[PDB]
Amino acid sequence: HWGYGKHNGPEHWHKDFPIAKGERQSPVDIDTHTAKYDPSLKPLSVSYDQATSLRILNNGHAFNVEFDDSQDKAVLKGGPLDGTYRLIQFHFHWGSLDGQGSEHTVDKKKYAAELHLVHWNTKYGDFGKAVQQPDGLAVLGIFLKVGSAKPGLQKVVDVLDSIKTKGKSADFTNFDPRGLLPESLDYWTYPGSLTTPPLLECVTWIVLKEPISVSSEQVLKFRKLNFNGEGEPEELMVDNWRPAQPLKNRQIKASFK
Ligand code: NI
Ligand code: NI
Numbered sequence: 314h315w316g317y318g319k320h321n322g323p324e325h326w327h328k329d330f331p332i333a334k335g336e337r338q339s340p341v342d343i344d345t346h347t348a349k350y351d352p353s354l355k356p357l358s359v360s361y362d363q364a365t366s367l368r369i370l371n372n373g374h375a376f377n378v379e380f381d382d383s384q385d386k387a388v389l390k391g392g393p394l395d396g397t398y399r400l401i402q403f404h405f406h407w408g409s410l411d412g413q414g415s416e417h418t419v420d421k422k423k424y425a426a427e428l429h430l431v432h433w434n435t436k437y438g439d440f441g442k443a444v445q446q447p448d449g450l451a452v453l454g455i456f457l458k459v460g461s462a463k464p465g466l467q468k469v470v471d472v473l474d475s476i477k478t479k480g481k482s483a484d485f486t487n488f489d490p491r492g493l494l495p496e497s498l499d500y501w502t503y504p505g506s507l508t509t510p511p512l513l514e515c516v517t518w519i520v521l522k523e524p525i526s527v528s529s530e531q532v533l534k535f536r537k538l539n540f541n542g543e544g545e546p547e548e549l550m551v552d553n554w555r556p557a558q559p560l561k562n563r564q565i566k567a568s569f570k
Contacts (some may be wrong), residue, residue: 314329315329315330315510316373316374316540317374317540317552317553317554318540318548323555323556326510326512329510330510330511332506332511332512332513332514333512335512336561336562337505337506337561337563338505338506338512338558338559339416339417339505339507339508339516339518339555340416340417340418340505340555340557341417341503341505341557341558341560341563341565342417342418342419342420342421342557342560343417343418343419343420343501343520343565344420345420346420347565348564348565348566349564349565349566349567350566350569350570351566351567354393354502354566354567354568355391356391356392356498356568357391357392357453357498357500357519357568358388358390358391358392359453359491359494359498360387360388360389360390361387361400361489361491363386363387364380364386364387364488364489364490365380365381365386365486366378366380366486366487366488366490367381367484367486368483368484368485369469369472369476369482369483369485370476370481371476371477371478371479371480371482371538371539371550372479372480373479373480373541373542374509374540374553375405375406375553376473376476377403377404378402378404378469378485378488379401379402380400380402382399382401382433382440385397385399385435386399386400387399387400387490388400388432389432389451389453389519392500392519392568393502393517393519394517394519395448396434396435397434398432398434398435398450398451399432400430400431400432400490401431401432401440402431403429403430403431403490404429404431405426405427405428405429405535406426406427406429406508406553406554406555407425407426407427407457407532407535407536407552407553407554408423408425408426408551408554409536409551411425411459411529411532412425413425413552413554414426414427414457414554415457415554416454416508416555416557417454417456417518417520417557419456424456424457424458424524425459425527425532426456426457426527426532426535427454427455427456427457427554428456428493428525429452429453429454430452430454430455430490430493431450431452432450432451432453433449433450434446434448434450437449443515444511444513444515445515446515447504447514447515448515448517449515450507450515450516450517451516451517451518451519452516452518452519453519453520453521454518454520454521455494455495455521455524455525456521456524456525457524457525457526457527457532458524458525458526458527459526459527459528459529460526460527461526461528462526462527462528462530463492463493463525463526463527463528464492465489465491465492466492466493466527466531467531468488469488470531470534470535472485473534473535473537473538474537476538477538477543478539478541478542478543478545479539479540479541479542480542480543481543493525494521494525495521495523495524496523497521497522497523498521498568499522499523499567499568499569500519500520500521500522500567500568500569501518501519501520501522501565501566501567501568502517502518502519502566502568503518503563503564503565503566504518504563505518505563508555509555522567522569535550536549536551538550540553
């Protein structure tokens with residue numbers, strides 16, 4: 314009833330999910346000429362040393378690499394955040410062509426893809442309760458450009474053949490998400506939403522300034538995934554991004570001058 318196809322894409326989502334036209338929707342365009350440095354901000358604290366990855370799942374929209382979130386094993390703190398946010402999953406949004414695929418844009422530039430590391434605020438006890446709160450989630454977004462390979466992505470690439478179609482999963486232990494980060498943790502932040510239905514306005518977005526590079530071969534393997542289930546007509550999993558939404562009464566703050 315929702316997807317990225319010819320008849321159920323982002324422009325239709327409002328019919329089932331009227332908050333699609335809400336006041337704090339994501340993604341947005343990040344205008345680097347109007348975002349303002351905020352000295353109240355602190356450095357990010359990314360603490361992933363004890364991360365426990367479990368599984369990778371093709372959910373028909375993207376794939377999620379899932380983590381054990383039943384203890385403070387992989388947490389995000391600092392920055393704009395108060396309290397402790399636990400990593401639950403990461404996933405990507407990507408294009409059919411190297412010139413589109415990201416959800417956020419920077420001065421209207423689209424990247425080839427965007428990585429989302431999704432975290433929930435431990436004060437709310439579980440993910441499902443967290444998404445009902447304005448400060449329930451923190452999503453660390455990282456742009457991908459095509460250039461050099463990202464070595465730390467390759468284990469994800471090489472399992473994709475085992476999860477080609479919707480509903481397939483595979484064991485995915487011992488993956489280190491630190492290998493997906495750029496060098497700098499400089500960031501932009503703003504209040505927004507989930508970028509898929511139910512589009513809840515529960516996210517503090519933290520979007521890194523520095524992209525990571527992935528190879529053309531790595532991206533091509535993402536583009537072999539399927540939206541469909543096994544035994545259904547093949548629909549390549551590409552262009553699983555929502556376009557920029559109106560900023561409305563929000564300000565984007567920068568952690569850097
Ligand atoms: Ni549906
Ligand atoms: Ni996402």
